Every structure is written in structure tokens, then in C-alpha cells.
Design a protein around this ligand. Structure first.
Ligand SMILES: Nc1ncnc2c1ncn2[C@@H]1O[C@H](COP(=O)(O)OP(=O)(O)O)[C@@H](O)[C@H]1O
Ligand SMILES: Nc1ncnc2c1ncn2[C@@H]1O[C@H](COP(=O)(O)OP(=O)(O)O)[C@@H](O)[C@H]1O
Length: 810
């Protein structure tokens, strides 16, 4: 009588009693209940009877026959046979060890009522048909372990870091794998962009069930180098691998897949038949250049693989990747990574590690900086070590004196005990403050590592439906450790506030990241912590360090660079474009050198094109070569000397790049120029020469250009300054011998007037300094004439030539 029901069961009964009242019936009858249930939106009872084999349309009419006979008049009582339905529901509820009468308890109870059981027999439902349908609704590979990595196992064991910000590509891999043709994804990108992480991320989704049911598959990574180690036995190992994949019906990730298709033994004829018979399902990884040689060039591989590009993440996306990996390195090294460390890792790796790719190179900075911090933390503090070591000396000295009986030994022993005790008074506090801070910090680390191991074991128990083990872990072990960890994080914060030493020892901040970046690059830290904004605002100072007398040209160059870097220029353009119109010998090439060294980190990242040899009419086909230079190093200045020599074939090739942003290769490929600067020189007061230019040029190509600079002639004061900086370069070499190069006005005037020519500028200057100064200077350094620590005087002799006065005879 006094029973407990689910809300859904109570709703069924109330609905049964309202249907009873709608046929004006005196009291509620199990056929009311049965019919109400069969008619519920998305009826359970209907689905159970369909699965038990029943004829739901006859069963319902049969229930409606018993229901029609029930007596009528004109509150709601229970039929003796309803009261019996609830008795049996309640007995099922107890047999299943359930606590509330649920709607499947009513369905099973209908079958206990002989009247209701008959209707179900006449619809084909036996009692074993009905019981089975409701019980339902409630509830080794040798070569793969030698040669592959079970990548879905790593995911299930927690041994695999999170994969952040690649959910579009992972889901694209899943759609490709599900195509009828071209259903083998080939991850194509450069080293370190995360091609392997995309395979690892799919493994992760497979283990969590965020996949279609057609990809509940293991993912094995084929170790190609492991196939070759220890030797035609390559072919026999691979066949056994492919056989065992095929029957575990797994997906195979193959890194460096080109090295098994031609790049060192070739197994293309082993893989190809299997990939085509669909026997093998495969995820490749390789680089774009190698995809084009070994997968496109074979028509039958192109027909089975799909190119999936994996681009390098930007600085913004790398910071997101780092914020996601952060806890994993913190828990591993026992350190705190400040967010500014992350930001500085991504920004400095983007700007100073230009030979390597995101996110690998930034992660790599973090790891090294974390390892540095933990080395320091694990090192003995110097003050405790100095005292421990001096106390050890004293104690060995006391052992020796302990048995000497002369007065002088007794006296020295008392001095030794007094110095021992003094050290102990200074040492004991320092040692117990180190042992408790270090001990606490270690325990935070150890507990944090056990919390991860527990969470993974608990997530494993849950997927396997091991409730007892997941229950021990989630509710007893994890909370026990979380509480202890919380106590220590509180003790630590109080202990740090009471030291007030201003020291964040366990903290990897920007200083630590730059210590690494300095080391990896040899650039001192001081040069590293200017922002990109300050370097850009002083860019003019950078060039003024070597380019003399061209202050106007430098302002124009630098402003145009700043337009690009502030994002104010059109994306469908190159970074910048200048036409250097000045006298030769004044510093056109020097400015290009300066740009590559400032704008790209690499002074040699310049691509030169003489145009007199590209004056041929079909020279553009050979430009070919132009495409492959800025594909290979995309961050590059692109210098065009003798632009006069340029045919109107090549003139209109730049107008593409300049108004489009990329050149189309002679094979159809797009070679990107969005990170090149483009410079063009031409030999062709100030206010007049600019207009002699204008009388020549096609306007649509010159307005496409950012700046048109007019360089100015080296004036006699710029002439002395250029020669004074060359002598400074000579001095910088003599400083390790402590020599001083005193050059007088007579000689600087000789270098001034004889080192500079009216049309070829400062080109003569350097041969003159080698022949007229450094040659005799080299003779004097060798024969003792000028010695370390001396002044080497330079003047001009009575015949008219540079002389280096000598300080000693031969
Ligand atoms: N999206 C990402 N999220 C987290 N870690 C990533 C991501 N992409 C790459 N990584 C990590 O960066 C490093 C380089 O990636 P990896 O997959 O090995 O590159 P590739 O296979 O292209 O050479 C690895 O430590 C990898 O775990
Ligand atoms: N204004 C300048 N300041 C310092 N050195 C200069 C200057 N102009 C030219 N030079 C020096 O002259 C040398 C040759 O000059 P270069 O770049 O070939 O002349 P341009 O390209 O303008 O015809 C370079 O090594 C450079 O150091």
C-alpha cells in the first residue's frame, strides 16, 4: 500500500486514473495503466513489446477490450486487480534491489496478472520474451609490441599530455578516415608543428568515446627505425606488423612515412596492395616537400591518401598550447610557471629561434627553464655548505688534538671547540629553515604527482565499470591527498610571507626564460628584454650605427616597416617595397644588409637577383629559382640590383606579388611573399632629381611601391666619419693585444681624399686600408716593431704615403 514510486511511474498512474475517469469508470484498472503506457510519447512499454516480438496493434486492442468492459457510473478507487498490479510491481522492485517502483516494474507486473498476461501471449510475447527485453534495457600481438607504440594505451594510462587547439583537424582526420576513397589522412607539416600530437589527440578521443562507433580502434604508431635495427629481414618484420594490424583491425600512424616509400629500404609494394584492398587504414606524417616527391608523384598513392595540412601555430595559439601543458611541467619539475614566462617563451622563440617551429621550440624553452629552476632548488645552499665544511675541518682537528697533552694543544683544542659551537649557533637555524621549506615543497610535488596518477587510474576504473576501485579512489584517496596538499599550500604561503626575502625560488618567470634564450643564441640578456615596440621605435638608431649620412633614407625605410608591423598595411601585399634611387657607393646595399639583420634575425637571409642576366625574354621561367628561394627561407629581403636591366616580363611579375601577396610557381604552387621585403636599386637639389625619375617610369608599377628614396652624396663631414668608423674596426681587433692606433690628421685626410671616389663612393676605402695601413702594420706586429700595450703611431711620410711609425728596431 504505502510504497514509493519514481516521478515517471507516478505520472503513469495518475494518467491511468485520468483515462479511467474519461470513460467514466468507477475505479482504476490495470488495462488503463497498460494502455496509457503504450500511448506515451516514445513509449518504453511499446519499445519493449516490439523488441520482445509482439504485435503492438493487437496487444493494444486487446488491452482496450478488457478496459471497455469495466463498470461505469455517473473519488477514484483502485480495483482489487490494480492493488494486485502494485503488489507485483513492488515485488519486482525488491527482487531487482531497487528502491523506487519504476515503469519497468509496472511492465513486468502486467505479466503477472493472468488477465494481462493473456493479451500479451496473443500478441506473441512469452514471459521469457518479456523478461529478457526488460533486463536488457536496464543494463596478445607479438610484432606490434616489438615495433609499434600502442598510442591508445598511452592515452588510457594518462601518460600523454593534453592536445590543445587542434579539434578542427582531429575531426577532419575522422571524416577522412570515413570516406569511401582518399580515406587515409597524410598529416603534412614541418618538424615540431604537432603532427604526432594530432595522432595522439585522436587516440585520446577514441579512449573517451568522442568518436563515431566506426573508430573504436586501437591506434599504433609504427617505429620505422625499429624495423631496420638488426639485419632482406626488413620486409619480413613489416609483413608481420601489417598482418597483426589487419586483424586487430587497427589504425596505423606512420611518422616519416616517406622513408618507407622511397627515402633506408623501400616497402611501397608491401603497403600499396593492402591500402588499396582497404585492409589497412593509415595516418601518415611527412613534410610538404617530401609529400610532393613521394606521395603525389605516384598516382596510386594520391588516390588513397588525403593531404591534411598542419600549419605552425601562431604566437597567440602557442601561448594557449603552453597554458594547457603548464600544469604537466609544473607537476613534473615541482615548480610554478608564471604566465609571463609562458608569454615570453612564445614571443622569444618566435623571434630568436628562427630555424625551428612552434610549439616544439617554446615547450623546449619551458622544459629547460623548469629544469634549471629545479637544479637550483635541489642544490645545497651555499651558506649551509660553507659552515658544514668548516665545522668538519674543525672536528677532524679536534679529534687529533683530543689526546695531545702539551699546554699548546689543550689551548688550541679549546679554540676549536669555541669555533665549532659558534658555527653550530649560526648553522642550526639556517638548516632547519631549509629542511622545512624544502621538505614542504617536495611534498607538494610528490602529492601533486600522486593526484594525477590517481585521477587517471580512476578514469580507467570508470571506463571499465570497476565501481569499487573508482569509488576507493574518487571519494577516499583523492580527497585525502587534496586536503593534505591544501594544508601545505597554506603553510607555504604563510612561511613565505614571514621570510619576506623578496625571492621566488621555485618560480619560472621571464628572467629564467631569457637565461635560456641567451644561452641558445649567445645574445646577451640585456639585448633580449627590449620589447618589439622599443626595438621598432629605435630602429633608426640601429641603422645609424653603420649607415652614415643617410638619415632621410632611414626615416623613410623605418616608417614603412612600422606601417607593416602595426597591422595598418593590406595583408594582400608584401611587408614593404622600396625603390632606392641614389648614387652608388652611398649605402644602398648596406641598408639591405641592415634590414635582414634587424627584421629577420639573420644578416645573411638576403636573396640577390642580378637583373642583367634575367634580361632574357624567357628569363621568367628560370624565375623556377625565384620561387624556391622564398619558399626555403620565407623570412627574407629580396634585392633587385640593376633594376634598369629588368625586362617588362619581370617588371610585371612583381606587380603580382605586390598587389596579390604571393607568386605562382611554374608548376602551379603558391610561394608565399607575405613576409618578404622587396628592394630595387637604380642609378637613374634633391627636389630636382626626384622628378628626373618621374620622367621615365610606368605609373602603375611605381605607385604599387611604398617608398621611393633619393640618397644624398657623402659630404666631406660624412667622409671623415666613415673613415673614423673603419679605423674603429681596426682598433677593435688590436684591443686583445692592448695596442692603440693613433692616426693623425695627415693620414685621415689621405684616407679621406684617396679612399673616396666621386661615382663609386666608399668602395675603395677598404683596399686602401689593407694596402696602405694594415700591410705594414702586420709587418710590425710580427718583427717586434709594435708590441702589445703600445701606441702604434700612424702618419704620412715626406713622399706622400701612409706610414706606421715603428717603436723598435729589427
Ligand atoms: N596542439 C598541441 N598541444 C599540445 N602539445 C602539442 C601540440 N602540438 C604539438 N605539441 C607538442 O609539441 C611537441 C612537438 O610536436 P610533435 O607532435 O612531436 O611534432 P611533429 O610530429 O610534427 O614533429 C611535442 O612535445 C608535442 O607533444
Ligand atoms: N654611408 C656609408 N656608411 C658606411 N659605410 C658605407 C657607406 N656607404 C658605403 N659603405 C661601405 O662601402 C662598402 C661598399 O658599398 P656598397 O654597399 O657596395 O655601395 P652601393 O650598394 O650603394 O653601390 C660596404 O662594405 C659599406 O660598408
Amino acid at each position: 500500500s504505502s510504497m514509493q514510486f519514481t516521478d515517471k511511474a507516478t505520472e503513469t498512474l495518475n494518467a491511468a486514473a485520468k483515462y479511467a475517469a474519461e470513460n467514466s469508470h468507477v475505479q482504476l484498472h490495470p488495462s488503463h495503466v497498460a494502455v496509457v503506457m503504450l500511448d506515451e510519447e516514445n513509449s518504453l512499454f511499446r519499445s519493449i513489446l516490439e523488441k520482445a516480438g509482439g504485435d503492438v496493434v493487437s496487444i493494444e486492442r486487446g488491452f482496450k477490450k478488457i478496459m471497455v468492459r469495466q463498470p461505469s457510473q455517473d473519488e477514484m478507487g483502485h480495483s482489487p486487480e490494480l492493488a494486485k498490479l502494485l503488489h507485483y510491481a513492488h515485488e519486482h522492485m525488491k527482487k531487482q534491489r531497487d528502491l523506487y517502483i519504476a515503469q519497468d516494474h509496472l511492465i513486468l507486473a502486467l505479466a503477472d496478472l493472468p488477465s494481462m498476461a493473456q493479451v500479451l501471449k496473443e500478441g506473441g510475447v512469452t514471459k521469457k520474451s518479456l523478461e529478457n527485453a526488460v533486463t536488457h534495457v536496464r543494463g596478445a600481438y607479438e610484432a606490434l609490441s616489438k615495433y609499434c607504440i600502442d598510442l591508445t594505451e598511452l592515452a588510457a594510462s594518462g601518460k600523454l599530455d593534453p592536445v590543445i587547439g587542434r579539434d578542427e583537424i582531429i575531426s577532419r582526420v575522422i571524416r577522412v578516415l570515413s570516406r569511401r576513397t582518399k580515406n587515409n589522412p597524410c598529416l603534412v607539416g614541418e618538424p615540431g608543428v604537432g603532427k604526432t600530437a594530432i595522432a595522439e589527440g585522436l587516440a585520446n578521443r577514441i579512449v573517451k568515446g568522442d568518436i563515431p562507433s566506426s573508430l573504436q580502434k586501437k591506434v599504433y604508431s609504427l617505429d620505422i627505425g625499429s624495423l631496420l635495427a638488426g639485419a632482406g629481414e626488413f620486409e619480413e618484420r613489416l609483413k608481420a606488423v601489417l598482418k597483426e594490424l589487419k586483424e586487430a583491425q587497427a589504425i596505423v600512424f606512420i611518422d616519416e612515412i616517406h622513408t618507407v616509400l622511397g627515402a633506408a629500404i623501400d616497402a611501397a609494394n608491401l603497403l600499396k596492395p593492402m591500402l588499396a584492398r582497404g585492409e589497412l587504414r593509415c595516418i601518415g606524417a611527412t613534410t610538404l616537400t617530401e609529400y610532393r616527391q613521394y606521395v603525389e608523384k605516384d598516382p596510386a598513392f594520391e588516390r588513397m591518401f588525403q593531404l591534411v595540412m598542419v600549419e605552425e601555430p601562431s604566437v597567440t595559439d602557442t601561448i594557449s598550447i603552453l597554458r594547457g601543458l603548464k600544469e604537466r611541467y609544473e607537476t613534473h619539475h615541482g615548480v610554478r610557471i608564471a604566465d609571463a614566462a609562458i608569454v615570453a617563451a612564445a614571443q622569444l622563440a618566435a623571434r630568436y629561434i628562427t630555424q625551428r617551429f612552434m610549439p616544439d621550440k617554446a615547450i623546449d624553452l619551458i622544459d629547460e627553464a623548469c629544469a634549471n629552476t629545479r637544479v637550483q632548488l635541489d642544490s645545497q645552499p651555499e651558506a649551509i655548505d660553507k659552515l658544514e665544511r668548516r665545522h668538519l675541518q674543525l672536528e677532524v682537528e679536534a679529534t687529533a688534538l683530543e689526546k695531545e697533552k702539551d699546554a699548546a694543544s689543550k689551548q688550541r683544542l679549546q679554540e676549536v671547540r669555541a669555533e665549532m659551537a659558534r658555527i653550530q649557533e649560526e648553522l642550526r637555524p639556517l638548516k632547519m629553515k631549509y629542511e622545512s621549506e624544502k621538505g614542504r615543497l617536495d611534498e607538494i610535488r610528490n602529492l601533486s604527482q600522486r593526484l594525477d596518477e590517481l585521477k587517471a587510474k580512476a578514469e580507467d576504473a570508470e571506463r571499465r565499470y570497476d565501481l569499487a576501485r573508482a569509488a576507493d579512489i574518487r571519494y577516499y584517496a583523492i580527497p585525502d591527498l587534496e586536503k593534505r596538499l591544501a594544508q601545505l599550500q597554506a603553510e607555504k604561503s604563510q612561511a613565505d610571507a614571514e621570510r619576506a626575502d623578496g625571492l621566488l625560488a621555485e618560480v619560472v618567470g621571464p628572467d629564467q626564460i631569457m637565461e635560456v634564450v641567451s644561452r641558445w643564441t649567445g645574445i646577451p640578456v640585456s639585448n633580449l628584454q627590449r620589447s618589439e615596440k622599443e626595438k621598432l621605435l629605435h630602429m633608426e638608431e640601429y641603422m645609424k650605427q653603420h649607415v652614415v649620412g643617410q638619415d632621410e633614407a632611414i626615416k623613410a625605410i623605418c616608417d614603412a616597416i612600422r606601417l607593416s608591423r602595426t597591422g595598418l598595411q593590406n595583408r594582400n601585399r608584401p611587408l614593404a617595397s622600396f625603390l632606392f634611387l641614389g648614387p652608388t657607393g652611398c649605402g644602398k646595399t648596406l641598408c639591405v644588409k641592415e634590414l635582414a639583420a634587424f627584421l629577420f634575425n639573420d644578416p645573411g637571409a638576403i636573396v640577390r637577383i642580378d637583373m642583367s642576366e634575367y634580361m632574357e625574354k624567357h628569363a621568367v621561367s628560370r624565375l623556377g629559382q625565384l620561387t624556391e628561394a622564398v619558399r626555403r627561407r620565407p623570412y627574407t629581403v629580396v634585392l633587385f640590383d640593376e633594376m634598369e636591366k629588368a625586362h617588362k616580363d619581370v617588371s610585371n611579375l612583381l606587380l603580382q606579388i605586390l598587389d596579390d601577396g604571393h607568386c605562382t610557381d611554374s608548376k602551379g604552387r603558391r610561394v608565399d611573399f607575405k613576409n618578404t621585403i622587396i628592394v630595387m636599386t637604380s642609378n637613374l637639389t634633391k627636389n630636382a632629381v626626384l622628378a628626373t625619375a618621374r620622367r621615365h617610369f610606368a605609373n602603375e608599377f611605381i605607385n604599387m611601391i611604398d617608398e621611393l628614396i633619393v640618397f644624398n652624396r657623402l659630404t666631406p663631414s660624412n667622409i671623415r666619419k666613415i673613415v673614423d668608423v673603419r679605423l674603429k674596426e681596426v682598433q677593435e681587433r688590436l684591443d686583445e693585444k692592448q695596442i692603440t692606433l693613433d692616426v693623425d690628421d695627415k693620414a685621415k685626410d689621405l684616407l679621406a681624399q684617396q679612399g673616396f671616389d666621386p661615382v663609386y663612393g666608399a668602395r675603395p676605402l677598404n683596399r686602401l686600408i689593407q694596402h696602405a695601413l694594415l700591410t705594414q702594420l702586420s709587418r710590425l706586429l710580427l718583427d717586434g716593431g709594435v708590441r702589445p700595450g703600445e701606441i702604434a703611431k700612424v702618419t704620412v711620410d715626406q713622399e706622400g704615403e701612409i706610414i706606421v711609425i715603428r717603436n723598435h728596431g729589427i
